[PDB]
Amino acid sequence: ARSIAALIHDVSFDFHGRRMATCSSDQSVKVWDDWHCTASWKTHVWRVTWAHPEFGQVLASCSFDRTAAVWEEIVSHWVKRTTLVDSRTSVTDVKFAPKHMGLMLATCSGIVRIYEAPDVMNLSQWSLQHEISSCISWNPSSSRAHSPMIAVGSDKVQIFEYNENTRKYADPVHDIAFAPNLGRSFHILAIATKDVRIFTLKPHNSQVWRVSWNITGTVLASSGDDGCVRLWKANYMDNWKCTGILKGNGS
């Protein structure tokens, strides 16, 4: 529709949805906050997603140089307090863990370098508290009865849960997204593949791309090689159904 001024490899909102981080094809990431570019970085960026605001305005950039840069808020050209460059292979994506589980970032290169920062104020140190060896999805569950889970996609989804007893984590897939629960007793999984797939876990006709879940995890936006951002949603029978088609060019 409204083609605001901005090749953006990945564009993602923050928690409040008032600032947009876009990773250009020229190895640059910009915080496009009438979206006007309010920053310029030159990156070092396959995926750039924000962090939870209470943890600071941290943007995680996954590059092809076998590193996962994390640009931390220092007011504008944000200074990299930390640099998670310990990954042997290129970081496919960098998605922060939910705020309840602490400052954890996942870089599903296959080495899931789950870097944890014990000091919130001093995030310059990244500790690989866990390491399990295309898409990285985090479970937004914060329940006492729901253990934290980390999902890894391969270009085909495996969920690793940090079991309390052991205190340790235990068609090609393009992007995996977990819907926000909002007290649900089940999890809805959206996986980007040759065909869009939706699955329930209860305790385009082409190559799909980074599908995202809304703030409530009910209406779905699945994009693919067809060039049309099709909007999906549930139905009266609690089943996935098409809810609309949006044109990328704005028609």
Partner 1 sequence: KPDILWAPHHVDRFVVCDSELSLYHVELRLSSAATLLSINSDTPYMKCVAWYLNYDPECLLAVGQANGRVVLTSLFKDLIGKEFVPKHARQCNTLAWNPLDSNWLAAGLDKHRADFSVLIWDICVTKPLYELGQNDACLSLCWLPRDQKLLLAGMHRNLAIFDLRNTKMFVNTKAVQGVTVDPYFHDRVASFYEGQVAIWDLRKFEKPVLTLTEQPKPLTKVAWCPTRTGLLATLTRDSNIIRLYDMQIIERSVQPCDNYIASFAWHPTSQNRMIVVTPNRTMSDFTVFERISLAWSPITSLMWACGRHLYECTEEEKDIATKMRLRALSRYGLDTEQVWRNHILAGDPQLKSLWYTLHFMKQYTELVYAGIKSIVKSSLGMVESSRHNWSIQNLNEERILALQLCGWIKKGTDVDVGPFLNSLVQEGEWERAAAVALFNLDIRRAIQILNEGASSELNLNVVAMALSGYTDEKNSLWREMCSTLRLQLNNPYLCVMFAFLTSETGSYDGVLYENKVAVRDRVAFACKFLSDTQLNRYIEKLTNEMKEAGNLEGILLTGLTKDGVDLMESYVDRTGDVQTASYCMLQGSPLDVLKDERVQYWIENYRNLLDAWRFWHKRAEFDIHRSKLDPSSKPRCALCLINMQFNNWFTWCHNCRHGGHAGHMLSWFRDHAECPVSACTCKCMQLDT
> Which residues of this chain interact with partner 1, rule CB under 8 A?
1-13, 15-18, 20, 22, 24-25, 32, 35, 75, 142-145, 180-186, 207, 209-219, 221-225, 227, 229, 231, 233, 238, 243-244, 246-250
Q: Please, which residue, 113 or 187, has the CB nearer to partner 1? A: 187
Least distance from partner 1 to the Cβ atom of residue 246, Å: 5
Least distance from partner 1 to the Cβ atom of residue 120, Å: 14
* Unique residue bearing structure tokens 């296959």: 110
Q: Please, which residue, 52 or 130, has the CB nearer to partner 1? A: 52
Q: Please, which residue, 13 or 160, has the CB nearer to partner 1? A: 13
Give me the phi and psi of 85, to 5 degrees please: -105, 15
Report the C-alpha gap between 109 and 68 in whole angstroms: 9
Least distance from partner 1 to the Cβ atom of residue 171, Å: 14
Q: Please, which residue, 118 or 244, has the CB nearer to partner 1? A: 244
Long-range contacts of residues 197-205, Cβ cutoff 8 Å, at least 24 apart = 198/240, 201/159, 203/145, 203/146, 204/228, 204/230
Q: How many CB atoms lie under 10 A from the CB of residue 159?
A: 17
Q: For the residues of 146-212, what is the DSSP string, one character each? A: S--EEEEE---EEEEEEETTTTEE------EEEPP-SS-SSEEEEE-SSS-EEEEE----S-B---E
Least distance from partner 1 to the Cβ atom of residue 217, Å: 7
Least distance from partner 1 to the Cβ atom of residue 242, Å: 12
Tokens (6 digits) for 240: 């996935």
Least distance from partner 1 to the Cβ atom of residue 83, Å: 24
Question: What's the full length of the chain, in residues?
Answer: 251
Q: Please, which residue, 71 or 126, has the CB nearer to partner 1? A: 71
Q: Please, which residue, 132 or 229, has the CB nearer to partner 1? A: 229
Q: How many CB atoms lie under 10 A from the CB of residue 243?
A: 15
Report the C-alpha gap between 202 and 127 in whole angstroms: 32
